Amino acid sequence: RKDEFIDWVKGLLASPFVLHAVSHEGDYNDDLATTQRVRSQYADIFKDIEGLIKDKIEFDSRNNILGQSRLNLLVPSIGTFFTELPLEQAFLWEDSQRAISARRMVAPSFNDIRHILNTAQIFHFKKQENLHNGKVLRLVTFAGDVTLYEDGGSLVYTNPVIPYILKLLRCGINVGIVTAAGYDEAGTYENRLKGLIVALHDSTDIPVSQKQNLTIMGGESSYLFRYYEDPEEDNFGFRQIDKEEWLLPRMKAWSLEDVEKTLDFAERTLNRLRKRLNLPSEISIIRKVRAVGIVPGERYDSKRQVPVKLDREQLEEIVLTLQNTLESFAPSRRIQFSCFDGGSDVWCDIGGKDLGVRSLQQFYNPESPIQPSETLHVGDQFAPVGSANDFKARLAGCTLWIASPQETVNYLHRLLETD
Numbered sequence: 001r002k003d004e005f006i007d008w009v010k011g012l013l014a015s016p017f018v019l020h021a022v023s024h025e026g027d028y029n030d031d032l033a034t035t036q037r038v039r040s041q042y043a044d045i046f047k048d049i050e051g052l053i054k055d056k057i058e059f060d061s062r063n064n065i066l067g068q069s070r071l072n073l074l075v076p077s078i079g080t081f082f083t084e085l086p087l088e089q090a091f092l093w094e095d096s097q098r099a100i101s102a103r104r105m106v107a108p109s110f111n112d113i114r115h116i117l118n119t120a121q122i123f124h125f126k127k128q129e130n131l132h133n134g135k136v137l138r139l140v141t142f143a144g145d146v147t148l149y150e151d152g153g154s155l156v157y158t159n160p161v162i163p164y165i166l167k168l169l170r171c172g173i174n175v176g177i178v179t180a181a182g183y184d185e186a187g188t189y190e191n192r193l194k195g196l197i198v199a200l201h202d203s204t205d206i207p208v209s210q211k212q213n214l215t216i217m218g219g220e221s222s223y224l225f226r227y228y229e230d231p232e233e234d235n236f237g238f239r240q241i242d243k244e245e246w247l248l249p250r251m252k253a254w255s256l257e258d259v260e261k262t263l264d265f266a267e268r269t270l271n272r273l274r275k276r277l278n279l280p281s282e283i284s285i286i287r288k289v290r291a292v293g294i295v296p297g298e299r300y301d302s303k304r305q306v307p308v309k310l311d312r313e314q315l316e317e318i319v320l321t322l323q324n325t326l327e328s329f330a331p332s333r334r335i336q337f338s339c340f341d342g343g344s345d346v347w348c349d350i351g352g353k354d355l356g357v358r359s360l361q362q363f364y365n366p367e368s369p370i371q372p373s374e375t376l377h378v379g380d381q382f383a384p385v386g387s388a389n390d391f392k393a394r395l396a397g398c399t400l401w402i403a404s405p406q407e408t409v410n411y412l413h414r415l416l417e418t419d
């Protein structure tokens, strides 16, 4: 299941949906009073959950006859909440926009609750701003694919997310692009983020010191770059930081022998899969220094170049096989890794985005590291397995679970607008 917590919330809402909304599906009239009654019922449930989250935050920071928070007993796979969530307020806002309580035949959905949770997380940080002594946002990180641009895409100059990233940098907020795309070379990132770095360079609104608060953490936690601008020349872009300056102690402790054996085992497994699944020859296995993956290809013939893709069932088969085999392999158990299905491909990366975000939290301010409660990672891959390379970011900070580049822009708009 994609998220036990969201599915749990969805199931709770089903009872008042059936009893107070479906019971009126054949109504001739009185549409509004029914809507307001449904709305109150849902709101009450979100208010209750809001209270369970506060209760869990208190439990988690102090440390029940069963040795767990109430909400953990209710939802065993639940992650950590680094901030409270104004769920009732967020429900009421989303209901006004989406008219959830006005439905009579379609229950509150997974995506409804996903939206409500994102809006609650945004609302929490908007509140901190208006607060004296506010626990304000200090780090916003983004996945690339599906989050900043279409899958496999680049950030072109007319991309509407760019003004919002510049506004984050302008407000003093640190911005990291934490992406599985893993290049030991600034040039490739400069091409894929070209529109963003040109707009940032062109900006006269932003001090250079703040422009340089833009970073890339590539390969999830393998390659760190920082935006630079030395006016001596018309030169700007990204410069790589040596890993000795930013690798976390736990990562420094890993054996490079275990790193290598992990990638070798994954590569061998991908080759085995490619033969067993009789994949088209145009499909490629790509081995990198800190990753290995399998990707689509292309062929001629129409008189037309056409993509050569893996089926959905093959991608699922491959990512499950990699994940399960590596969880049973001693060298990969001694380090960390992330396997994911990106939609059209499957990769195994050394490390993971929890390590990438945590690395940035310290890198940006070694003397007073950015806290999880001050961090927001935005991405699309939040399933626990499969479409999953953002999932571990929940270990390092708050998250926003988006579904498209358009959602990312909508949420940054609401985060940053004046209300």
Ligand SMILES: O=c1[nH]cnc2c1ncn2[C@@H]1O[C@H](COP(=O)(O)O)[C@@H](O)[C@H]1O
Pocket: 145, 151, 152, 180, 181, 182, 183, 219, 288, 290, 291, 292, 293, 295, 342, 345, 347, 348, 349
């Ligand atoms: O090292 C890696 N680890 C995991 N995913 C990668 C890596 N390199 C590239 N990707 C992703 O794989 C796809 C193909 O990469 P591209 O051809 O370099 O753009 C894109 O979705 C990339 O973002």
Ligand SMILES: O=c1[nH]cnc2c1ncn2[C@@H]1O[C@H](CO)[C@@H](O)[C@H]1O
Pocket: 003, 004, 005, 006, 077, 078, 079, 080, 081, 085, 117, 118, 121, 394, 397, 398, 399, 400
């Ligand atoms: O199991 C979980 N599912 C969804 N969100 C979670 C979970 N655990 C912790 N959070 C956090 O709740 C906020 C709103 O979704 C986000 O910060 C998310 O990371």
Ligand SMILES: [Mg+2]
Pocket: 143, 144, 145, 146, 147, 379, 380, 381
């Ligand atoms: Mg993505």
Ligand SMILES: [Mg+2]
Pocket: none
């Ligand atoms: Mg590549």
